[PDB]
Design a protein around this ligand. Sequence first.
Ligand SMILES: *[C@@H]1O[C@H](CO)[C@@H](O)[C@H](O)[C@H]1NC(C)=O
Lengths: 116, 49, 49, 49
Amino acid sequence: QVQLVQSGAEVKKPGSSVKVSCKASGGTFSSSAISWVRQAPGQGLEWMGGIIPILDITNYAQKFQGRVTITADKSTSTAFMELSSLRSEDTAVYYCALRNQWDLLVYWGQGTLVTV
Amino acid sequence: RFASVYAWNRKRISNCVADYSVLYNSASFSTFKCYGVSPTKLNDLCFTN
Amino acid sequence: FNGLTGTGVLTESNKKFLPFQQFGRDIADTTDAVRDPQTLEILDITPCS
Amino acid sequence: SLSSTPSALGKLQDVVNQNAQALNTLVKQLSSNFGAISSVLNDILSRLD
Ligand SMILES: *[C@@H]1O[C@H](CO)[C@@H](O)[C@H](O)[C@H]1NC(C)=O
């Protein structure tokens, strides 16, 4: 059983950056792919990017080719995402989710609310 | 969905990494037996075909 | 090298492996050369001492 | 006479040839299974517990 602990809510100012952590449980940090999505109020849920820690390969959505950094720290089994150059349009609930190799399930967090 | 045994389904796996720790350690399998290799060394080895 | 273990000294060499050959073997089935998996160089292997 | 007869020194040549065969046999005997899965200790150790 895999559960992901999300960061709490935060209020940012224009031009700043926000960093959100994703704490894994159930191990399997290596061998799984972690994705990040965001849901702006009134919108659907949109994929931003993601990383595979064992491969150390990071992929991003085209609209996020810049301003978004996705990394991971294997020693704490924690994944991270940072969004820079914030504006009010960036308000969203941010989520991490895992898709483990060997499985077909996706393990989702509660959601981190960030406004600017 | 699984295939009938009389007409089993075989697939090719390639150009990827496999962490066999998960299958091995998971308690869900009734049978986990390897032939010619140690289950615990599957992660050290690299395979073809 | 792709699961092939041992102890030894690597040197560069001029063995020309065919496109499908991955490893070389001597008279006693000892790997005596390998093709490096990332850069396809042929490396001879000799004992350390 | 010695220069022209190639067999003249066979008595000495034979000693050399016999000892060479004795060693070539030991090396060739390494490539045997003797009931083992392989002739190479490193492969046995690499894949098995
Ligand atoms: C493997 O990736 C490295 C970068 O981490 C790169 O420098 C190297 O050329 C790549 N090798 C092959 C065969 O693609």
